[PDB]
Design a protein around this ligand. Sequence first.
Ligand SMILES: OC[C@H]1O[C@H](S[C@H]2[C@H](O)[C@@H](O)[C@@H](O[C@H]3[C@H](O)[C@@H](O)[C@@H](S[C@H]4[C@H](O)[C@@H](O)[C@@H](O[C@H]5[C@H](O)[C@@H](O)[C@@H](S)O[C@@H]5CO)O[C@@H]4CO)O[C@@H]3CO)O[C@@H]2CO)[C@H](O)[C@@H](O)[C@@H]1O
Ligand SMILES: [Ca+2]
Ligand SMILES: [Ca+2]
Length: 684
Amino acid sequence: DPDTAVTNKQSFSTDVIYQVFTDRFLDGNPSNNPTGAAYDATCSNLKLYCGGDWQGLINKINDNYFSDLGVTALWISQPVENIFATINYSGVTNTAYHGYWARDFKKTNPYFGTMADFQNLITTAHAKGIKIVIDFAPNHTSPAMETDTSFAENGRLYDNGTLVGGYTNDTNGYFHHNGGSDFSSLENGIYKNLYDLADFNHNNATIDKYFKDAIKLWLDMGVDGIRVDAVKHMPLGWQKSWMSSIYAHKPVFTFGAWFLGSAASDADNTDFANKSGMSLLDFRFNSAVRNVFRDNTSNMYALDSMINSTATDYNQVNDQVTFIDNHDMDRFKTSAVNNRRLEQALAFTLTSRGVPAIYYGTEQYLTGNGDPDNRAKMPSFSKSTTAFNVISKLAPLRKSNPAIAYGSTQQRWINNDVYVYERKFGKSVAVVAVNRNLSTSASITGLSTSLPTGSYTDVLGGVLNGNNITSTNGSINNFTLAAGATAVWQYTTAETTPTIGHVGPVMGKPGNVVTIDGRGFGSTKGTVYFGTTAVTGAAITSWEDTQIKVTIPSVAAGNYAVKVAASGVNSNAYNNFTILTGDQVTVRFVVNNASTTLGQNLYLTGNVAELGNWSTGSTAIGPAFNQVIHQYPTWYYDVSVPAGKQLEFKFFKKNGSTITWESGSNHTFTTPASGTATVTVNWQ
Ligand SMILES: OC[C@H]1O[C@H](S[C@H]2[C@H](O)[C@@H](O)[C@@H](O[C@H]3[C@H](O)[C@@H](O)[C@@H](S[C@H]4[C@H](O)[C@@H](O)[C@@H](O[C@H]5[C@H](O)[C@@H](O)[C@@H](S)O[C@@H]5CO)O[C@@H]4CO)O[C@@H]3CO)O[C@@H]2CO)[C@H](O)[C@@H](O)[C@@H]1O
Ligand SMILES: [Ca+2]
Ligand SMILES: [Ca+2]
């Protein structure tokens, strides 16, 4: 199978995701619509159900709406059963139309469809070459009040119909009872309730098992990707452990939502994208794009700066999911925002690095500020808008041109309003020119690119006032970039030498199968390198010119670079691949009497790669927490660690460059074969 095929569940770099609120798209089956005060046929009260379902999505796939648009993947609302109760917030009636108020993760939402309808969605989608990504929110259940069991459904959780427990009289401790978060710190937002939503205690063995079992169900049904909700509100450790169980079963592209207000670098966000095992929604990319094209609060330099900065911060920048807007912010289009600006933002996103996602209705210039106005019903299915055209012409390029899907990014020409960047992967090139100025054209001179000698036509065909250019060994002849113009020029050819464009997933234990996408691998099975270790023969389950499926070797756990050798020639190295010791379990390390100095933090390290292999650098675990579950001088932290292994570890204090280790002998602990555990020790 090509890296391009719909069967590639491990990489979305060549795809274009279409995010849609199932309820607000198309009601293909009115028979499953809710009744009473929870429904609104006219869909004017955006807090109620409008009727949209999976049958509606099926209908639009069959009548080629998505195929003509060019999108190759659908990101739908959480498919699990949500609460049925209606909630009254200060006079206004609220429903679980969004799918975020789950009550049973092992059953479907009857309003969206039956288990059979879902299977029908998967089948119909894969037939037309479209992948299905689902929303999954393992952080909480639904709104709840501990003192009032009559409010909503008391955040009750069900296991395929069987009641597990509710928020009140939670003797088993399935949920956190530490009040609501004030968002003052990372720790505060992880162990306290997100508003009134009942927060799960993933340290509980039953809850841990439940989510591993629950996700396997949906994976087994054929889902191609997972968008994890509120990753910033659950321990990285548990999530990493959960992630490894998924990758050991049926690996699929997984990304999470870690909200960011600006394009500025955030330490915790970067660590998560680099250490969790999943990528993230690129909010930094989003901010820059909006500041420049929408709000006019930044110029083209802020755009180039963001490109360079994110490529530096994230180990795998191509795995970050880009977008111009979504359900968490105001629609890109506003009366003060021109159609051309939205169109340019799209063109930019579609030709830039990462995995592009389009919020439903963007092609129809849908407006709407804040929740719930930004989740209005699809106004029409017109295929004649300029935005629709841009997407249908640029989206396919992610499949046909590897420069756009796997390439690096380099600035070629720039000023306050003009931006010319180049995507390059091997001998394939793509050059995009953008002039955000709506009234003045720009005279471009001295433009140098990697385009071979020849005449290039605008891939957009001039719909965005693009023009044709002429190359003479890279040097482009002088031309005028029209007002509000944006053009795309490309060049593609076959690769003779091996070039790795993507590896998915980037974390796993020996025995797992990983996918390597690229160009020039040849038909004859060669050899795959994980550092120095060579993998050949049966270990390589599949080998083609554009994709290689290989089994992770039994080597020491650690960070490795991946390389491919075909016909004696070595390819480029794909860095930062994490090999685990084996199966993972989440363990809470608790240390008592660890009093510190001002600005001094407590960290943890031990004899396994998951603990940093006695390192005190960035691979060490920490800084530890000391406010919610346990209070200072007691510290704690949830860590994904190998199952059934005898571990040795020690805590250490670190302020500046001074390290203070625990005295005495190392602490020891044998981890459980599965689930979770808590190990408490005293600072030596
Ligand atoms: O304080 C009392 C409070 O009562 C209600 S608030 C009430 C609201 O009216 C309802 O609409 C409903 O909101 C839910 C949304 O409709 C639903 O889509 C999700 S939103 C989801 C986000 O998508 C996700 O980003 C994350 O939250 C993000 C924020 O979006 C982001 O801006 C920043 S601040 O980071 C956050 C975390 O990273 O998680 C949420 C939750 O899944 O759920 C919400 C919550 O249910 O329900 C709320 C209360 O439950 C009154 O309206 C208020 O006036 C009043 O103050
Ligand atoms: Ca319906
Ligand atoms: Ca939480």
